[PDB]
Symmetry: D2
Subunit: 130 residues, 4 copies
Amino acid sequence: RPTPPNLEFLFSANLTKGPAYIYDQSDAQIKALQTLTGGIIAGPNFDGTVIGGTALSTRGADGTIRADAHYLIQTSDGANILVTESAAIPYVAVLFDTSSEKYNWLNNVTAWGTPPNLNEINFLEYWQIE
Amino acid sequence: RPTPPNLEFLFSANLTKGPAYIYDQSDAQIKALQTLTGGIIAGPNFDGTVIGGTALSTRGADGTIRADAHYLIQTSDGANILVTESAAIPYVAVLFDTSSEKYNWLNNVTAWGTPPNLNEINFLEYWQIE
Amino acid sequence: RPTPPNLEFLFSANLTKGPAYIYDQSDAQIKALQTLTGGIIAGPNFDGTVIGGTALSTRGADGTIRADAHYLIQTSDGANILVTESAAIPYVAVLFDTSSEKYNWLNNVTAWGTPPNLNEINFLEYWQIE
Amino acid sequence: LGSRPTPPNLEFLFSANLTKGPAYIYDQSDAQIKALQTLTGGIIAGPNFDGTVIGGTALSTRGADGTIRADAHYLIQTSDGANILVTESAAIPYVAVLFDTSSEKYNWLNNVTAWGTPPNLNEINFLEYWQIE
């Protein structure tokens, strides 16, 4: 029988965003670019801040929302880490890239996050899946 | 304590692939394209076959392997579904796109899969994370 | 005043494709996946064939078609080259990746192609722009 | 019988005078150097559309082989208020460009492939772009 993967808490993120800029609107769908302006990252094995990035989203009247984002985390001790997100909002899949010797274990991680309280859409908790 | 998401079995995939074509070999890294030639998909709420697609991979001597693939599933009842995979191999994150009325719930799904036995790398089991 | 780049003929492609599989049709757009099953490449630097690849296309309600493809050329001498196409159909922009010593000048090339006859769309001529 | 390949036409489309954040290198290894860089603003000019760049991000990889590949997205807001997504892909210093807008005035750009490069390579933030068709 299929055995599920384990889940281990990885980090929380409290992000700030500029207003979306809609560039392609039809009556049932809007596509936008949104600047990721900052935020704090906090987990057991790393922490830091978001220096910047961009999200591209497509939001349907049917309730679907697809988003793709790249942003960079700089850790407390100075490592730079690219975060690549792809999301069926509010569920977010995450990959990471860094050459930092202390953080390059993230290169092999698939993570997943969602806001624990949808009232507060920009506070997310993420989990390592494996 | 953060609450983890739930995991629900979504589908298995037994995929066939052509040999990789390595186009860029550099210090301790190879980048390749691989054709996805076919495969069977079996889950509680959908099933079908893989019509085709492509995987792009970057494999490092350091053990990291990043891959990104697109392939199309045609269900038994005739729906066409795009699968978008992104992976820190052997861990695979998945998104779906279809306008089929019976299967468009998948548009809101983030799934995750891995081979249950790495002996048989092309048989994977995937889970809906939410 | 602005001075334009120069154009030199790079190669032609006579491509074969599988069926177009439409996976997402709605009022805003029609989205399909299509396999590249083969093809003949001919140019001053090399002849070769298309090993395989995949194209994703979106036809908007507005009429415009945007396509994004990846495919692999293998030259007659066995070198592999990744071709990354992005198109405002029928105008195709092209980027390349190969570590082959004979052909690695392609890494630095931006190319552009289009079918000389729009009722014979699988034959295209491509130009190096710089 | 065979016809000789004939080239497309080039028409000047726009210039961009861009401002950028710091280049944040996240992955340095023997094979390549990978960075993320914010686009903080910029002036868009030319005969077809003018405006400013609202924001965007560029990802670049410099390989050991000497190639520099970059991929960027940024948003132009024109002087009259239309939003246009610009998708760039580059074998630096040569830049290919695609556009997305639903603006009625500017949606001709949806059918455009453009190409640009800095006319002065020691001023990398000023580029001139051409419509190819």
